[PDB]
Scaffold this motif. Structure first.
Motif, PDB file in Angstrom:
ATOM      1  N   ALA I   5       0.838  -1.195   0.000  1.00 42.82           N
ATOM      2  CA  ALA I   5       0.000   0.000   0.000  1.00 42.82           C
ATOM      3  C   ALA I   5       0.875   1.248   0.000  1.00 42.82           C
ATOM      4  CB  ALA I   5      -0.920  -0.001   1.209  1.00 42.82           C
ATOM      5  N   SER I   7      -0.156   4.396  -1.567  1.00 41.43           N
ATOM      6  CA  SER I   7      -1.039   5.533  -1.310  1.00 41.43           C
ATOM      7  C   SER I   7      -1.845   5.282  -0.037  1.00 41.43           C
ATOM      8  CB  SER I   7      -1.987   5.758  -2.489  1.00 41.43           C
ATOM      9  OG  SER I   7      -1.288   6.203  -3.640  1.00 41.43           O
ATOM     10  N   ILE I   8      -1.480   5.977   1.040  1.00 42.99           N
ATOM     11  CA  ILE I   8      -2.149   5.832   2.338  1.00 42.99           C
ATOM     12  C   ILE I   8      -2.370   7.186   3.010  1.00 42.99           C
ATOM     13  CG2 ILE I   8      -1.404   3.474   2.815  1.00 42.99           C
ATOM     14  CD1 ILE I   8       0.835   4.789   4.612  1.00 42.99           C
ATOM     15  N   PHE I   9      -3.301   7.219   3.959  1.00 42.70           N
ATOM     16  CA  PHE I   9      -3.597   8.423   4.734  1.00 42.70           C
ATOM     17  C   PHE I   9      -2.504   8.739   5.747  1.00 42.70           C
ATOM     18  CE2 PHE I   9      -7.893   7.004   3.519  1.00 42.70           C
ATOM     19  CZ  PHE I   9      -8.370   8.172   2.950  1.00 42.70           C
ATOM     20  N   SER I  10      -2.358  10.024   6.053  1.00 43.08           N
ATOM     21  CA  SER I  10      -1.456  10.497   7.098  1.00 43.08           C
ATOM     22  C   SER I  10      -2.283  11.089   8.240  1.00 43.08           C
ATOM     23  CB  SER I  10      -0.504  11.544   6.524  1.00 43.08           C
ATOM     24  OG  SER I  10       0.454  10.927   5.686  1.00 43.08           O
ATOM     25  N   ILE I  15      -3.316  12.196   1.668  1.00 52.13           N
ATOM     26  CA  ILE I  15      -2.657  11.115   0.945  1.00 52.13           C
ATOM     27  C   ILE I  15      -1.477  11.741   0.206  1.00 52.13           C
ATOM     28  CG2 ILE I  15      -2.919   9.216  -0.684  1.00 52.13           C
ATOM     29  CD1 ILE I  15      -5.993   9.457  -0.209  1.00 52.13           C
ATOM     30  N   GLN I  17       1.159  10.664  -1.434  1.00 51.10           N
ATOM     31  CA  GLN I  17       1.489  10.169  -2.772  1.00 51.10           C
ATOM     32  C   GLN I  17       0.638  10.808  -3.868  1.00 51.10           C
ATOM     33  OE1 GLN I  17       4.786   8.754  -2.787  1.00 51.10           O
ATOM     34  NE2 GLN I  17       3.733   7.578  -4.383  1.00 51.10           N
TER      35      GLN I  17
END
Ligand code: MG
Ligand code: MG
Lengths: 231, 204, 233, 195, 211, 235, 244, 222, 240
Positions: I5, I7-10, I15, I17
């Motif tokens: 994965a 592309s993930i949330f921060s 996101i 990426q």
């Protein structure tokens, strides 16, 4: 600390932190009580709302005509596990023309939860369940934890402030076990038990949720004005 | 029904003195109906010649396939493929379709560029090599070709004599077969020159 | 799809007032050759069920193993395996019936005809049939193969309907079964004299009788039969 | 028998295709166009098993149109015919083969020459001055063997084609309900509305 | 027997109502017209289940189209969804005859014949089923482009009657529809047991019969 | 780095909690349920005046009896809508009936937690699913990326949610008319919006039993905005 | 688990660059210089072998110039092993096109296909990109003589004259100065060698440190010939142009 | 060669009233010329006031019924204990049958109950899923004997009013439950006489707003 | 397969990426789209750092998806080819099944859906590309202009710009473009598009590409001299 990044990692003292964090989600969840006699088994659940405009989140799920559970924690995880129980109860009926034993239902849940604690990539279930049922060996009450541990009990409670209700049941053990052939009195004992876990708020008509199963009683859920009798 | 005799056609190859010859008819039909009189069945990849009889779609398909394989061979090996090696490539390629074969009867002809030795070979539809010294035949008039070649052929013929022998073998065999004829082509091959002749034959 | 090789013939059964009786001969035929003469085709499951199987013997031995494995598996994590959560005839039957219909649906059947005889927890008699097609039915009398044609008529004279069951004793029912087995030995060309019989009573439990023989046969009248019509001598 | 004919003359290719669609005992339609434009200077007629014919033609059409957009360039008739042949040669060893015979008429703008290709359902390709599929060839091939020249005009090609259709209308047992005629030349593709 | 023809005032759709299993008449009251949407009709011939199942499935796909595209599907695209579907199942044994009749602004009134062989044909007139020949006989001989909505409705009704009479596997009753700019319009169920005698008397036809 | 399906020490899924922060950055969407219908309204929030605002589609039809408004990463909602539409139509195919609003919502929420290392992350969008059925009548649901859904009498999601929710707390009662609800959505939208509310930068919609789901025209909304201004000036 | 050890080869930097592509280009900048020059009557390909030895068998050696088909050739700059993987793929692609359409593949189509493969390694799969830059020299009947270049990013562009590998900045300036549109092959040969002779890191440019090739219509009548120069032929053209 | 299908005989009959519905079927089960059981139930209470029978090849009929009962169970789980309407049940059964279009359930299926307006409803299916709501339907072995009788005595077909001579039809007066059960019993008594696979017993399931009731009657055992 | 994965949330709900993909678009050469009353014009920047280029064979910035729709872009060039190829395939697939060419909105919705899919699929990174999709629907004379971006969101624009220094040219368009009266003719529309690019481009020589799309599949690319005449006329009016 360094050993809580995933479920596949023991700590230096032999602890599984991701499982312990999943256990924490249950403690944040709303209180629910389970208890039984020799003839009947009862679930009592305090439902939680988001605000005054919102509905009260459902806590009790039916699995078969003779079995069901109440949840505390991540509701979607309870939906997955209850769906699995529904299928297992159903497989037992279609193939063997046999109602699934409550003890065996607990064993199946234990093994399903366990696989998620030993493999990389996945995660533990974030919900605790109280399973009640009436089978060929009478009434039963189970407590499921997402660590995998399942326990058969006379009575218990899980969720926030559940220690108060659990102490009450520990005192009342000798009384409520004897409540045979009287569903209303067994529910009364359950409603009085869950009341020991309340602070500030009290049991209202759309707040309370009760379920019962017994000798000549299919698993049925009571909500709304159907529980006003017990308030 | 029988795939090998729907379109019709023949190929024959002969060795001579420091030379080889390969010839084919030009007919393509749908059973009784004659469709094309320009359907050549002989192809060449560098100095190696390949004649193919049988089902016309497979003839076309195999030509395109061996053109593909010989072009890559040349790029990697940095030299043209030889008849002996090409013969093994044909056998390999056909047997990989053992239980779903191409309905063809190939014939390889050429001269080894290094040894100068003339070389011919024939196959069945699934790969078996028939490496003959004298001649190779293939097609719907193979029986006829066997009879003509076996009687007319003699070893160590010169190019201009070999032309007459193979041409007469093909022509008279084709005239006793309903599905062969409608023209003919003969290749005379020497170490560094190749002549191609179209024969005048009866168009029935 | 297959063809049956080593085969077992009729399996007959009936209900009586306090339980069920089931019987089957000890033969394993190989076409017209009566090859194996010591084959047990009644297979007890616990002390409350007997499965009688006819048809292909190799498939019978496969089923025999499934049931043996079923008992083993039911005991796992089951403290009440010899009591409340013990295997019932209804459980065992539905399992087999599920398997038989699944196998026919894959076009690879178990070439058998099965009768599950037993007594339930509440003392109720259980008798149900299932075959290679997954077809199931229940009746006061059940029989497979030739038994369906010759035994059922005799057993239905004793128990013609449901109301006749309490009126029928174990001695009368066993007498009828044993008579039917004699008739099959007279008339079925793939039968044997030797057979096994099982009784499942709600009071006295499971009685399994082995090495029984057909007796009191009538053959003497054969001496008087001469020729095929006109032959006096 | 779904009559499809083709004739290549001096400066064009002419395709003629029957209009009838007969399913069983009834002629369901008498104005069916058994052809698809693959590119501005390439036309494909087709005949074979019901459903497969159109499905195959439109599939080929889509692929050639995709190529045209990608490269901003029209493929030569020879290139298109080879692509079509490979698809049929692939098809014949499939689970369920395309049961379709085709004629591909095109004008090569590079060489300034008309070209006619005949391909059957096995993937048997031949370039011809004139061609036909099915039973039509049994009458028309010998007729064209007698009346054809390479230097004929388009008008002479149409008169020659009328002679083919008249013979087919006289001697063939089915009523194929006449033909739709289309011409392929340097200016593109056009339909002869009166025939 | 089922027919559909195009004319001045739109489209006429007429079908019979009989269903058979060999010589056994299984039903005289079946619906061979499916109301896909307010502007689309589907006719059914051949396998009862095949037609029913896949034409109700077609309606679901046409509904999904107008949800995604915010626009009613065309008859061309609707007919082609069905034809592409049956083509996937070609050789498996499906038996369907279907006319997808309807109206849109850009197409106008349109009829497509769709077949389980994979055939998809656009046309002005179609008759399909075991009685198609009988309906064609009446319809073709009396068809004109400039019929009145009233005369056209009758012709389609009369053409089915003709087929119900002669074809053993057709009959029961006649279901009529008329399709215009503003959608389809049902024109009733007409029992043949009463319609036959009515037509015979009023029209003076059917002299082959004793009446 | 760290797992995508990891629990925090507090017993929450990191990724789910982070997706909720993305939803807080989204444009406002408000839903109000009444006995005469359910109203759905959204803030369009165009990034530039050259952007043709009518192309901003933040209110969406799922079926004739179910509508949907969105807030957050609106691109993520497209697959959720596609699934919802398919689920609604498929159920009608299998059962010859309309699908219950709750059952539709449950089907959408089943996608939510199908992420791991299935899709690579949770959805970054919240949905207000409004509809009507014969059993439970007019309903409004709030579907989150946690897989949880609550039913609501009224609900606001997006950047001005907590301010709008407090306003809905006071204003909502069980006897609200449809017209009263329409004005109430416009009132609260105008309160929490940065730019001045008009027919071009805000959109209304409703779902009734008779007419089904309808997105309001800009001409129709403009009149309701004018009607609002006058009634606020009336006292 | 395994995540701990993943380098994540296919991600953006905060600035919007692809780390691995940028680092692959850094690798290629140390590789031997390769030059391509396109003329009206042909194309030249010149390339410098990297610090060779006297014991290297040159006449059977090939590290820079490769043949894709009869009409198209490539000059390599970067990891040779990586280049050979792609070259064999490109050779197959050309043959696939020839089998399908019965025509030689247009140069751009072949270039696009290889460039699309390189692109894939930067967007998905978690693998490192190919550390290779190509100069494509080819001919077809549509556009005639064509020069292209592709790099690990999978981006490709057309050129009249171009250099890849080491000292491209210096090399491109020299080409930009002396190149003219009406130029011929013989003049382009001289330009290519003169450019290498000035940009080289070696003390002197000799035959044993070079690979050379031309694509000429200088073949008997309307057709195209590829000439991969032999060691002795490179030695002769070095004397002819007046470098040695 | 293995034949996966069989014929267990039997006959079934569904009649719809104004505010009730019946689904009847004989209790005999057979193979060829032998009787398997004289009492083997063929019509079942499937829940939600729906009765069902799948007549023909019993193994397929049992499987289908078993699957539909399961469908009803999961309809409750998935849709908040909502009652499955008869029209929704019919459509669900179409999909069960057509799901095996290329290896059919070899049965004639009939279901009965009440529609959403409280009126009696009968639905009839072919083996591969084509269905239709009807007022009257017989299925199985003796369906050819019984249906013509029902066309005559339920829908008053070919019946006219005396004196008019064929001009005016018999009016379609509704039938009571007591009148319907008479037609059912006579239908099966007649079928038992002339069809060898019909007999032993008759079991009728009557459906009203009050629930599902059963009635049993003896039939000739020859 | 590679399932990571990317592309993930921060913690702040971003996101990265997807946001870093927008930075790649910011780096890309400027692209502009302007729609008139009966036409749409797509303008594109060509950076003049690359001379000795062969402009015949170099990939053009504007790509035809079908005969009636075009696509320009800003960002990674290699990434744009993948979107263009997919779009072209879907365009032919739509014609094949629906028997009608794609609408500009549909084609945009497809391309945007592909871009979105790459933001929540395992083992892949988002496209570093924003597109401008323009054209005319079949049998329709209303001009269409849509924009897409790495996140997957899309929308319609009266006029829009993307790429490096797009902030400046958007500033120009916002004051110069009138909605009540858009560029009535082709000349007026092209002139406004060239003017907007001249705010950013540098030299008006070979640095500006213009492509005019008109109804009924009428697409043409302007030559150097034709564009140079616009550049000459604009500056001569400016000297006042
Ligand atoms: Mg041919
Ligand atoms: Mg009888």
């Amino acid at each position: 600390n360094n050993y809580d990044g995933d479920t596949v990692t023991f700590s230096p003292t032999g602890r599984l932190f991701q499982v312990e964090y999943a256990l924490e989600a249950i403690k944040q969840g709303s209180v629910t009580v389970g208890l039984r006699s020799n003839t009947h088994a009862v679930l009592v659940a305090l439902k939680r709302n988001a605000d005054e405009l919102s509905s009260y989140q459902k806590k009790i799920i039916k699995c078969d005509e003779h079995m069901g559970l109440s949840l505390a924690g991540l509701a979607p995880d309870a939906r997955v596990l209850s769906n699995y129980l529904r299928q297992q109860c159903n497989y037992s009926s279609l193939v063997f023309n046999r109602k699934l034993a409550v003890e065996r239902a607990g064993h199946l849940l234990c093994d399903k939860a366990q696989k998620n604690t030993q493999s990389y990539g996945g995660r533990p279930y974030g919900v605790g369940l109280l399973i009640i049922g009436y089978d060929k060996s009478g009434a039963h009450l189970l407590e499921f934890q997402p660590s995998g541990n399942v326990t058969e009990l006379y009575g218990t409670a899980i969720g926030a402030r559940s220690q108060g209700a659990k102490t009450y049941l520990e005192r009342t053990l000798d009384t409520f076990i004897k409540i045979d052939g009287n569903p209303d009195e067994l529910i009364k004992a359950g409603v009085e038990a869950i009341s020991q876990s309340l602070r500030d708020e009290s049991l209202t008509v759309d707040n309370l949720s009760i379920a019962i199963v017994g000798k000549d009683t299919p698993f049925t859920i009571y909500d709304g004005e159907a529980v006003a009798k017990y308030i | 029904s029988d795939p090998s005799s729907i379109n019709g056609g023949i190929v024959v190859a002969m060795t001579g003195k420091d030379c080889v010859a390969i010839a084919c008819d030009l007919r393509l039909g749908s059973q009784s109906l004659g469709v094309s009189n320009k359907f050549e069945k002989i192809f060449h990849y560098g100095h190696v010649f390949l004649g193919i009889t049988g089902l016309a779609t497979d003839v076309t398909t195999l030509n395109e396939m061996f053109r593909y394989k010989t072009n890559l061979y040349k790029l990697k090996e940095e030299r043209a493929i030889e008849p002996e090696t090409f013969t093994q490539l044909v056998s390999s390629s056909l047997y990989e379709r053992r239980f779903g074969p191409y309905f063809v009867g190939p014939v390889v002809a050429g001269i080894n560029s290094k040894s100068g030795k003339p070389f011919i070979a024939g196959f069945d539809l699934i790969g078996c090599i028939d490496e003959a010294k004298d001649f190779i035949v293939s097609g719907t008039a193979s029986d006829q070709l066997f009879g003509m070649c076996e009687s007319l052929y003699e070893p160590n013929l010169e190019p201009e004599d070999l032309f007459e022998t193979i041409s007469q073998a093909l022509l008279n065999a084709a005239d006793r077969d309903a599905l062969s004829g409608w023209g003919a082509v003969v290749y005379i091959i020497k170490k560094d020159e190749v002549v191609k002749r179209y024969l005048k034959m009866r168009q029935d | 799809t297959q063809q049956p090789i080593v085969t077992g013939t009729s399996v007959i059964s009936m209900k009586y007032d306090n339980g069920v009786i089931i019987a089957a001969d000890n033969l394993g035929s190989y076409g017209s050759l009566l090859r194996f003469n010591g084959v047990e085709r009644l297979i007890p499951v616990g002390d409350n069920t007997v499965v009688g199987i006819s048809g292909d013997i190799s498939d019978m031995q496969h089923i025999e193993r499934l049931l043996k494995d079923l008992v083993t598996e039911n005991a796992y994590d089951n403290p009440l395996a010899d009591a409340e959560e013990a295997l019932e005839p209804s459980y065992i039957f539905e399992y087999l019936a599920t398997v038989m219909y699944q196998r026919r649906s894959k076009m690879n059947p178990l070439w058998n005809a099965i009768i599950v005889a037993g007594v339930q927890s509440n003392g109720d008699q259980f008798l149900r049939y299932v075959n290679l097609l997954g077809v199931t039915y229940s009746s006061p009398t059940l029989a497979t193969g030739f038994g369906a044609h010759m035994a059922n008529p005799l057993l239905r004279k004793v128990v013609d309907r449901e109301s006749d069951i309490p009126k029928t004793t174990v001695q009368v029912a066993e007498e009828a079964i044993v008579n039917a087995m004699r008739v099959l030995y007279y008339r079925d060309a793939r039968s044997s004299r030797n057979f096994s019989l099982a009784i499942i009573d709600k009071n006295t439990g499971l009685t399994f009788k082995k090495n029984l023989q057909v007796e009191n046969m009538k053959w003497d009248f054969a001496k008087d039969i001469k020729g095929y019509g006109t032959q006096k001598i | 028998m779904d009559i499809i004919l083709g004739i290549r003359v001096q400066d064009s290719v002419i395709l003629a295709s029957s209009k009838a669609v007969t399913r069983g005992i009834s002629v369901l339609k008498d104005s069916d166009d058994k052809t698809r434009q693959l590119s501005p200077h390439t036309l494909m007629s087709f005949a074979g098993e019901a459903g497969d014919t159109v499905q195959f033609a439109e599939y080929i059409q889509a692929n050639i149109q995709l190529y045209s957009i990608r490269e901003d360039y029209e493929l030569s008739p020879q290139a298109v015919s080879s692509f079509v042949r490979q698809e049929l040669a692939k098809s014949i060893r499939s689970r369920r083969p395309y049961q379709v015979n085709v004629l591909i008429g095109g004008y090569d703008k590079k060489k300034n020459k008309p070209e006619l290709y005949q391909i059957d359902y096995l993937g048997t390709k031949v370039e011809l001055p004139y061609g036909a599929h099915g039973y039509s060839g049994f009458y028309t091939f010998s007729l064209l063997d007698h009346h054809y020249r390479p230097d004929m005009t388009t008008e002479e090609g149409l008169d020659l084609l009328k002679l083919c259709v008249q013979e087919l209308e006289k001697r063939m047992p089915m009523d194929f309900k006449g033909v739709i005629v289309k011409i392929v030349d340097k200016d593109g593709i056009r339909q002869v509305d009166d025939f | 027997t089922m027919l559909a023809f195009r004319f001045q005032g739109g489209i006429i759709v007429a079908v019979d109502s009989r269903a058979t299993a060999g010589n056994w008449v299984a039903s005289q009251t079946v619906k061979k017209v499916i109301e896909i949407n307010p502007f689309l009709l589907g006719t059914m011939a051949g396998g009862a289940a095949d037609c029913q199942f896949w034409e109700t499935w077609l309606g679901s796909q046409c509904r999904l189209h107008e949800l995604r595209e915010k626009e009613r599907i065309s008859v061309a695209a609707a007919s082609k969804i069905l034809s592409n579907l049956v083509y996937q199942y070609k050789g498996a044994g499906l038996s369907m005859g279907t006319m997808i009749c309807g109206y849109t602004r850009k197409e106008g009134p349109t009829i497509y014949y769709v077949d389980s062989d994979g055939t998809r044909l656009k046309g002005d007139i179609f008759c399909v089923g075991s009685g198609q020949t009988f309906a064609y006989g009446v319809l073709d001989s009396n068809y004109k482009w400039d019929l009145s909505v009233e005369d056209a409705l009758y012709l389609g009704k009369r053409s089915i009657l003709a087929a119900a009479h002669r074809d053993a596997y057709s009959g029961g009753s006649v279901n009529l529809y008329h399709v215009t700019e503003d959608g389809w319009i049902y024109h009733g169920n007409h029992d043949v047991g009463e319609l036959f005698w009515k037509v015979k008397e009023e029209e003076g036809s059917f002299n082959n019969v004793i009446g | 780095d760290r797992g995508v399906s990891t629990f925090s020490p507090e017993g929450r899924l990191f990724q789910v909690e982070y997706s909720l922060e993305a939803i807080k950055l989204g444009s406002t969407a408000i839903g109000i349920a009444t006995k005469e219908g359910v109203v759905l309204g959204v803030e369009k929030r165009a990034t530039s005046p050259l952007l043709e605002s009518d192309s901003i589609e933040k209110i969406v039809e799922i079926d004739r009896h179910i509508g949907c408004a969105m807030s957050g990463l609106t691109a993520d909602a497209r697959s959720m809508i596609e699934h919802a539409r398919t689920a609604a139509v498929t159920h009608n195919l299998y059962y010859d009936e309309d699908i219950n609003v709750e059952s539709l919502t449950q089907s959408v929420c089943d996608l939510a937690l199908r992420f791991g290392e299935l899709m690579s992350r949770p959805f970054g969008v919240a949905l207000l699913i409004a509809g009507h059925d014969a059993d439970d009548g007019y309903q409004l649901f709030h579907a989150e990326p946690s897989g949880t859904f609550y039913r609501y009498n009224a609900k606001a999601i997006g950047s001005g949610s907590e301010g709008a929710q407090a306003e809905l707390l006071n204003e909502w009662h069980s006897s609200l008319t449809l017209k009263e609800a329409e004005l109430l959505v416009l009132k609260i939208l105008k309160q929490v919006m940065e730019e001045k509310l008009d027919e071009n930068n805000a959109q209304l919609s409703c779902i009734t039993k008779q007419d089904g789901f309808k997105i309001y025209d800009n001409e129709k909304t403009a009149e309701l905005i004018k009607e609002l201004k006058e009634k606020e000036a009336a006292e | 688990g395994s995540r701990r050890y993943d380098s994540r080869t296919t991600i953006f930097s905060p600035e919007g660059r692809l780390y691995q592509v940028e680092y692959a280009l850094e690798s290629i900048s140390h590789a031997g210089t390769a030059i391509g020059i396109m003329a009206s009557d042909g194309i030249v390909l010149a390339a410098e072998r990297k610090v060779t030895s006297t014991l290297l068998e040159q006449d059977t050696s090939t590290e820079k110039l490769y043949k894709l088909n009869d009409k198209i050739a490539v000059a390599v700059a970067g990891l040779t092993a990586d280049a050979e993987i792609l070259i064999n793929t490109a050779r197959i692609h050309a043959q696939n096109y020839l089998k399908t359409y019965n025509e030689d593949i247009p140069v751009e189509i072949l270039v696009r296909r290889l460039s699309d493969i390189k692109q894939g390694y930067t967007q998905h799969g978690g693998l490192r990109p190919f550390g290779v830059s190509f100069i494509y020299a080819g001919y077809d009947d549509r556009y005639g003589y064509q020069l292209y270049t592709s790099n690990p990013s999978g981006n490709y562009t057309g050129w009249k004259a171009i250099s890849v590998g080491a000292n491209t900045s210096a090399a491109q300036t020299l080409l930009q100065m002396d190149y003219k549109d009406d130029m011929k092959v013989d003049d382009a040969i001289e330009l290519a060698l003169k450019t290498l002779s000035k940009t080289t890191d070696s003390s002197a440019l000799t035959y044993d440190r070079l690979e050379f090739a031309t694509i000429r219509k200088g073949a008997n009548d309307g057709e195209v010939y590829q000439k991969i120069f032999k060691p002795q032929e490179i030695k002769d053209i070095l004397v002819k142009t007046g470098i040695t | 060669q293995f034949n996966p299908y069989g014929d267990n005989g039997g006959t079934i009959l569904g009649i719809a009233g104004e505010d009730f519905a019946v689904l009847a079927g004989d209790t005999r089960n057979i193979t060829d010329y032998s009787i398997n059981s004289r009492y083997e139930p063929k019509v079942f209470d499937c829940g939600d006031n729906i009765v069902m029978s799948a007549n023909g090849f019993a193994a397929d009929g049992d499987a289908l019924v078993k699957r539909f009962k399961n469908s009803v169970k999961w309809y409750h789980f998935d849709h908040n204990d909502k009652k499955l309407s008869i029209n929704s049940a019919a459509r669900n059964i179409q999909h069960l049958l057509y799901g095996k279009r290329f290896f059919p359930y070899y049965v004639h299926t009939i279901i009965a109950g009440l529609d959403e307006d409280g009126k009696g409803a009968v639905y009839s299916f072919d083996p591969v899923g084509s269905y239709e709501r009807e007022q009257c339907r017989a299925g199985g072995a003796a369906a050819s004997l019984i249906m013509p009788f029902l066309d005559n005595q339920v829908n008053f077909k070919n019946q006219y009013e005396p004196g008019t001579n064929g001009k005016v039809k018999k009016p379609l007066k509704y039938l009571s439950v007591e009148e319907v059960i008479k037609l059912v019993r006579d239908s099966f008594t007649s079928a038992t006489e002339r069809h060898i696979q019909v007999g032993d017993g008759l079991e009728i399931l009557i459906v009203t707003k009050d629930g599902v009731r059963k009635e049993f009657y003896e039939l000739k055992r020859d | 397969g590679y399932d990571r994965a990317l592309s993930i949330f921060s913690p702040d709900g971003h996101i990265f990426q997807v946001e870093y993909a927008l930075e790649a678009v910011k780096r890309g050469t400027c692209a502009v789209g302007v729609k008139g009353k009966n036409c749409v014009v797509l303008g594109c920047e060509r950076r003049s750092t690359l001379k000795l280029q062969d402009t015949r064979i170099t990939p053009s910035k504007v790509s035809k998806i079908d005969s009636h729709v075009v696509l320009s872009f800003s960002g990674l060039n290699a990434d744009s080819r993948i979107l263009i190829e997919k779009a072209r395939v879907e365009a032919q697939s739509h014609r094949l099944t629906l028997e009608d060419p794609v609408t500009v909105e549909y084609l945009t919705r497809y391309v945007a859906g592909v871009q979105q899919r790459y933001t929540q699929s395992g083992g892949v990174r988002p496209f570093g590309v924003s597109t401008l999709i323009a054209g005319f629907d079949p049998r329709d004379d209303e001009p269409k202009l849509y924009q897409t971006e790495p996140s997957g969101i899309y929308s319609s624009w009266s006029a829009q710009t993307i790429g490096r220094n797009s902030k400046t040219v958007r500033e120009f368009l916002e004051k110069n473009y009138d909605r009540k009266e858009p560029p009535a003719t082709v000349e007026e529309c092209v002139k406004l598009t060239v003017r907007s690019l001249l705010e950013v481009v540098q030299t008006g020589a070979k640095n500006i590409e213009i492509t005019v799309v008109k109804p009924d599949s009428d697409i043409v690319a302007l030559s150097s001299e034709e564009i140079n005449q616009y550049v000459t006329q604009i500056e001569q009016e400016k000297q006042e």
